[PDB]
Amino acid sequence: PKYMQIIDAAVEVIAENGYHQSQVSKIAKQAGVADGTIYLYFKNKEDILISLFKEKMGQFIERMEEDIKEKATAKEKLALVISKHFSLLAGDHNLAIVTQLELRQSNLELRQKINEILKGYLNILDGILTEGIQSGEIKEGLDVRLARQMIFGTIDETVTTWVMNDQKYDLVALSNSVLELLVSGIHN
Amino acid sequence: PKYMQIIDAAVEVIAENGYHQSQVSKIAKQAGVADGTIYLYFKNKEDILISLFKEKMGQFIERMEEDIKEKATAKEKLALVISKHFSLLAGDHNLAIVTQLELRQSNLELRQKINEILKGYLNILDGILTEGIQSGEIKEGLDVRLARQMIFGTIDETVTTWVMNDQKYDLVALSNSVLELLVSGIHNK
Numbered sequence: 001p002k003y004m005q006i007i008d009a010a011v012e013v014i015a016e017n018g019y020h021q022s023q024v025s026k027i028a029k030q031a032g033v034a035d036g037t038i039y040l041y042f043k044n045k046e047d048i049l050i051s052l053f054k055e056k057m058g059q060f061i062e063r064m065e066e067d068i069k070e071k072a073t074a075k076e077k078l079a080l081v082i083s084k085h086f087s088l089l090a091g092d093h094n095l096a097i098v099t100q101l102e103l104r105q106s107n108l109e110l111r112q113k114i115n116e117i118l119k120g121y122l123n124i125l126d127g128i129l130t131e132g133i134q135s136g137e138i139k140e141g142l143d144v145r146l147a148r149q150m151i152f153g154t155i156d157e158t159v160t161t162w163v164m165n166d167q168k169y170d171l172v173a174l175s176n177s178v179l180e181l182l183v184s185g186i187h188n
Numbered sequence: 189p190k191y192m193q194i195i196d197a198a199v200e201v202i203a204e205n206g207y208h209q210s211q212v213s214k215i216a217k218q219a220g221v222a223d224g225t226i227y228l229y230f231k232n233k234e235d236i237l238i239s240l241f242k243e244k245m246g247q248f249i250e251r252m253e254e255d256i257k258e259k260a261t262a263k264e265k266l267a268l269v270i271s272k273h274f275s276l277l278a279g280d281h282n283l284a285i286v287t288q289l290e291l292r293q294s295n296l297e298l299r300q301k302i303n304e305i306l307k308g309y310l311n312i313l314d315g316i317l318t319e320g321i322q323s324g325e326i327k328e329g330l331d332v333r334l335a336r337q338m339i340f341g342t343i344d345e346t347v348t349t350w351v352m353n354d355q356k357y358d359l360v361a362l363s364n365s366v367l368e369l370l371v372s373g374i375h376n377k
């Protein structure tokens with residue numbers, strides 16, 4: 001449908017110049033749609049970015065809530081999440097730039113809307129950590145919120161450094177190393 | 189000072205209005221100087237953003253080098269880095285909005301310029317790790333670049349989460365627990 005066609009073009013255009021500079025007109029042209037056609041599916045520019053996050057990151061999130069259920073341990077569940085995330089971004093240069101660089105917006109309402117979608121991802125982390133503690137796999141006394149900030153911050157900084165390096169090295173190849181740093185930390 | 193008066197007014201205006209709505213005229217008004225005096229020191233709005241980051245980072249790094257030579261172990265140095273990072277930002281509401289939100293420009297030419305200023309701090313993290321590696325304090329097989337990304341992303345996301353909650357809780361008090369999470373990870377035992 002034209003809805004997804006438009007989201008896919010928006011990823012391209014938004015990645016090119018940045019969300020702020022991106023123009024709805026450029027998005028239509030790139031989608032090979034008329035200008036008014038865009039307004040047939042989206043209210044405005046912000047609705048395009050929010051929906052892009054909903055469709056790209058939101059789908060990923062839903063998929064992970066399902067797929068982590070088959071992994072026995074907290075470590076395996078986190079391994080799946082990091083590996084699948086790096087894989088989703090490694091498959092699309094534009095999507096890597098957008099989902100990393102447009103994640104935290106200055107405008108309050110736009111930020112809240114994007115944060116709402118990303119809460120889903122944080123809920124997955126908290127759940128993995130909560131259950132891991134009850135099974136005895138995860139550190140007893142662990143502050144779940146803080147440990148989720150370290151896991152999400154680590155994943156995010158790893159992907160953003162790769163984006164700032166033109167995505168030139170194999171991100172997916174790092175998933176296990178990133179996992180072991182989170183599981184065992186830096187001490188010997 | 190004229191240069192620092194402008195940088196300080198820029199922090200305020202950019203925090204309060206968002207970088208895109210922070211034009212030179214607004215900064216000039218905020219600093220109490222004329223537009224032409226802004227340009228006597230800066231090229232444009234972008235130059236003010238980049239220079240505010242370079243100036244604030246530079247002070248931060250000189251203090252860091254000063255304090256961490258006292259410390260013996262890699263864990264002691266990281267403890268100082270975390271607590272000093274959290275303290276600086278808890279100490280200046282508008283600067284934290286600038287660092288966590290306004291400096292995160294997605295245009296790539298500009299973002300590269302900003303990111304080159306981060307290199308000095310990342311370099312400090314890499315030296316703590318490599319010193320630790322030589323002294324046998326750091327886990328065998330640990331990759332320095334990845335460990336640096338973990339340390340800085342964990343620190344930075346802890347600050348972003350606190351900014352997202354309107355800086356309403358005591359960030360600084362979380363320093364030690366953030367350190368222990370980086371040092372031993374989430375595994376039980």
Ligand SMILES: CCCCCCCCCCCC(=O)SCCNC(=O)CCNC(=O)[C@H](O)C(C)(C)COP(=O)(O)OP(=O)(O)OC[C@H]1O[C@@H](n2cnc3c(N)ncnc32)[C@H](O)[C@@H]1OP(=O)(O)O
Nearest residue numbers: 160161164165169244245287291292303304306307333334
């Ligand atoms: C004011 C108060 C202050 C308070 C503290 C500061 C507040 C923060 C300010 C806000 C700004 C942000 O948004 S910071 C939060 C988000 N983070 C970022 O945007 C940082 C993204 N990272 C980067 O842009 C970069 O890492 C730099 C520019 C910072 C430094 O780049 P660098 O010096 O070249 O070093 P590096 O990135 O390691 O790249 C070197 C080589 O290694 C490769 N490489 C890099 N990482 C890896 C890796 N994990 N595994 C394999 N290879 C890797 C690269 O491809 C390149 O290869 P080859 O080319 O040779 O093949």
